[PDB]
Design a protein around this ligand. Sequence first.
Ligand SMILES: NC(=[NH2+])NCCC[C@H](N)C(=O)O
Lengths: 234, 234
Amino acid sequence: SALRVGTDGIYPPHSFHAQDGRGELTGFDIDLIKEVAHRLNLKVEFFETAVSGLITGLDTNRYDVLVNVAITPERQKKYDFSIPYIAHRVLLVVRSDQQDIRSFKDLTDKTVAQILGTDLSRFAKELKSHLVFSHNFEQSLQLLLSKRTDATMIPDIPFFNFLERRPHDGNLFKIADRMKDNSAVAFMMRKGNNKLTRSINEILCAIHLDGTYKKIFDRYFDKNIISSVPGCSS
Amino acid sequence: SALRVGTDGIYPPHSFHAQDGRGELTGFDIDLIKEVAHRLNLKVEFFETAVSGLITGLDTNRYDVLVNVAITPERQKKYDFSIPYIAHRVLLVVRSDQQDIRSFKDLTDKTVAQILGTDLSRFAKELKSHLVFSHNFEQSLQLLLSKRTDATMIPDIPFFNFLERRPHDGNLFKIADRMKDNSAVAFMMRKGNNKLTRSINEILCAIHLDGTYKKIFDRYFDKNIISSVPGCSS
Ligand SMILES: NC(=[NH2+])NCCC[C@H](N)C(=O)O
């Protein structure tokens, strides 16, 4: 039988297409949930969904597992999470010549880009910027350098991914602040899916042990920069 | 209304009594589970039991929550775990003069000190060592120093805490080897305690988000040597 998985499919390197959008669905999260499926003896079924419809696809039962979801207390209330399988940090990016903005605390009434997908709206309310949405990091960079924005807030994973893709890119921008603590990310299911949560959990543990979590991680992230999560025990 | 917790209080810094064994139960896992407890408005009830019957004590409803449990696939099958809250690293410790123990695979035909009824103790039996049963890590370490054993498999948290409390023993032990990954630790519960698990996980999430986690961790660890788990998202 089939393990139905919803995703946006446009968040490199979590869930993206091989290039210009025309190659297969791939990414760290994808290979991992595929691995999980293989180990539950299931053929995985992907449901690419617009960012706005990702949770409501769960609620609606278009699919059963949702990829690349940050744990929030109110999500733990209403849904089931797996054990965390990766984490990220928010970075604050600005123009190289920017001097008035040096911290998350400097963003008050400044206009600040967030790339859709990155789920940063709630963290950004507190902050208390006037917030705009960009399609990808390149788009935001065009806004940043032209001054249509005062900053972009982006999670590190995608940031550093951009830097590996385009690694001789001007030094036209910089990191002005970095989230000290980091934020756990996991698979999300409807509340009640409990047989399903413990298996995922169980497989994720067995994936860590036998060396596959590492394999898959190194395929996509630099271990030196990007935070992993913990291992397991036999 | 009461939240019942299993533990043996002879495991500094996890679980011990103040004033050299004469006072209140305290420790990192203690102070966290109470925090958790106060946030679900529960008075907390401690039941102390030798590690050997901790897990069976949870089978037989002597208490509801076990603290400081390393997640294994086997236990994931038969029990509910919380989100991880800490990580540990499984060290092979020897006397600093010892020359013929360079890996876990050299424990075969060596006298090893492990705690009765633990997985590390199972591991020693499997590696076909001469086992010596200790009643905690302090004794595992004392025995190593008295030459009544030649090694012990011990996680980093209680090992480094011994070294904090007795710094002149610093140079008498050495780490011969480590498991190449660290290992997640969580609260363990009987399968089907799903609303409880959702509640603990929610509260832990808040405990990270307000900086209490950090307060509790820094009370007992050097974040430079002990791995924390990822934080949450608002
Ligand atoms: N990663 C590990 N094997 N940790 C060992 C500690 C877990 C558990 N107390 C035991 O029986 O040993």
